[PDB]
Structure 1
Amino acid sequence: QTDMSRKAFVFPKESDTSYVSLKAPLTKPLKAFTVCLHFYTELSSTRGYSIFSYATKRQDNEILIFWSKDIGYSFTVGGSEILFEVPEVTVAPVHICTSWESASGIVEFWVDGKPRVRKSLKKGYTVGAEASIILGQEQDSFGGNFEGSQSLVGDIGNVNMWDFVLSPDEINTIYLGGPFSPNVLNWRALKYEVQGEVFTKPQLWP
């Protein structure tokens, strides 16, 4: 349990061996979640990259937030993908929150505190809770099989996860700053293991 407040993980160049493994108190399967995080990369007009990679022993893409060049954000749950298209890239750090709810299939995707349209994905599914949660690489197997062509080059931080859907008022707090207590991954009480070329530095964003 380490407090990572105001610090981010830095992956300064492309590799297939640099990653952070985040440990969640494994539990019953999830019927809903929210994941929020900050990241900052120049890779967006060049190639695609994984932002957050959650795999189970039986599904490598159990939850995957990904940037796909010439498209925009890619969001996948239990192997099924949906797109949130982005016509202009930002040259600045980005905050995202994304959520999924089994009962409705609704996915929300929030970029710098502003919502995309609601979309539909994997209504009725359950997300497994024996997970391998990885920052900086895209998993093709449980805890492994990374591709350098999907590695994250740049900074990522403030990764928090909850097992329910945050309301728009709660998102606004996470984006602007205020008190909250994530119950799956908490940045202020983070259990993690680093591997390869990854550094811990003061965050570049407010």
Structure 2
Amino acid sequence: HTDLSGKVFVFPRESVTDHVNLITPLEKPLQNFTLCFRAYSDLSRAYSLFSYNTQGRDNELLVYKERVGEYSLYIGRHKVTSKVIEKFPAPVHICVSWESSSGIAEFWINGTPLVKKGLRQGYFVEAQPKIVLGQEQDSYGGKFDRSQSFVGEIGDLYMWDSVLPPENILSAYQGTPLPANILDWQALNYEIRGYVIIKPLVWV
């Protein structure tokens, strides 16, 4: 695993091939989680930010930007969306969390909580996933779609198997996240497939 501190992955072009696989030893179904990352894209169409599919299950966990000012979260093929005021183009810091017990999804955009939404109360996002950055999956590992691909830069990705309270979200936003135990930018196991480059993070 690699230390990607002060670095980002830049997907420099639109394609249906370019993507990087994120590898975690996830054995037990997710009950809770929080996923934070930074992104910088000047795409005005919709795209996938983070895809997570399991054997025979599409959009098990998907974080999707519909358009400017609105973000969607998919849990077990059901989705929820929340709006926010934001500049275009501009770098963005995103956290989203979800708990199975209340069904509540929480988005934070640049430190700022959006309205809470709920979906899939009492569900478990299954284990042994295929997580990819740069493309939206429609099979376990594949069936990409050029019109949902992400082109730009992603950095500082962390994923925890708990719902973080606001002070921890805020730490991540401001550059000091707690060590994450599902995905950690500072000890990341990834595969680059296609044309993606690691360049220093110069937009924060």
Tell me, in whole angstroms, the C-alpha distance in 1 between the residues paired with 2:93 and 2:136: 19
Q: Is 1:116 aligned to 2:114, yes or no?
A: yes
Shift of 1:17: 0.3
Tell me, in whole angstroms, the C-alpha distance in 1 between the residues paired with 2:117 and 2:163: 14
Tell me, in whole angstroms, the C-alpha distance in 1 between the residues paired with 2:80 and 2:158: 22
CA contact (8 A) 2:81 2:117 kept: no
Shift of 1:179: 5.0
Alignment coverage as a number of residue pairs: 204
TM-score by length of 1: 0.95
Pair 179,138 (structure 1): closer, same or farther in 2 beyond 3 Å: closer
SS of equivalent residue, structure 1 residue 169: helix
1:146 alignment partner in structure 2? 144
2:135 alignment partner in structure 1? 137
SS of equivalent residue, structure 1 residue 65: strand
1:16 alignment partner in structure 2? 16
Shift of 1:177: 2.2
Shift of 1:84: 1.2
Shift of 1:89: 4.1
1:35 alignment partner in structure 2? 35
Pair 87,94 (structure 1): closer, same or farther in 2 beyond 3 Å: closer
Gaps of 5+ in 2: none
SS of equivalent residue, structure 1 residue 125: coil
CA contact (8 A) 2:84 2:114 kept: no
CA contact (8 A) 2:37 2:157 kept: yes
Structure 1, 24-33 or 142-151: larger mean CA deviation: 24-33
1:160 alignment partner in structure 2? 158
Shift of 1:4: 0.7
**Match 2:48 to one of 33, 47, 50:** 50
Pair 168,179 (structure 1): closer, same or farther in 2 beyond 3 Å: closer
TM-score by length of 2: 0.96
Tell me, in whole angstroms, the C-alpha distance in 1 between the residues paired with 2:92 and 2:165: 20
SS of equivalent residue, structure 1 residue 97: strand
User: What is the aligned-residue RMSD (CA, Å)?
Assistant: 1.3
SS of equivalent residue, structure 1 residue 172: helix
Shift of 1:114: 0.5
1:47-92 Cα deviation digits (max 9, x unpaired): 1100000011121201111111377211111100111124654321
Pair 102,19 (structure 1): closer, same or farther in 2 beyond 3 Å: same
Q: Percent identity between the aligned chains?
A: 51
**Match 2:81 to one of 79, 83, 106:** 83
Tell me, in whole angstroms, the C-alpha distance in 1 between the residues paired with 2:68 and 2:153: 22
2:126 alignment partner in structure 1? 128
